[PDB]
């Protein structure tokens, strides 16, 4: 369980828009850890790893 730190607008290509404060579930990471595949109420897709952090 994670929370978004900053807004991120999807740039297509299976990225996912997220808003500061939203909760996410993390499925995994790409090969260099820069991208994170996450699930929110809005769907599923890749977000910047640095834009989220664990919560609770």
């Amino acid at each position: 369980l994670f929370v978004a730190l900053y807004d991120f607008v999807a740039s297509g290509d299976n990225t996912l828009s997220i808003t500061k404060g939203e909760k996410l579930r993390v499925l995994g990471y790409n090969h260099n850890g820069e991208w994170c595949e996450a699930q929110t109420k809005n769907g599923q897709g890749w977000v910047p790893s640095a834009y989220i952090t664990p919560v609770n």
Binding site: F8, S11, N30, H31, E34, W35, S49, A50
Partner: peptide, 10 residues
């Protein structure tokens, strides 16, 4: 995942 890097945190 995208082949390009994500934006840096603000």
């Amino acid at each position: 995942a995208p082949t390009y890097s994500p934006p840096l945190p603000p």
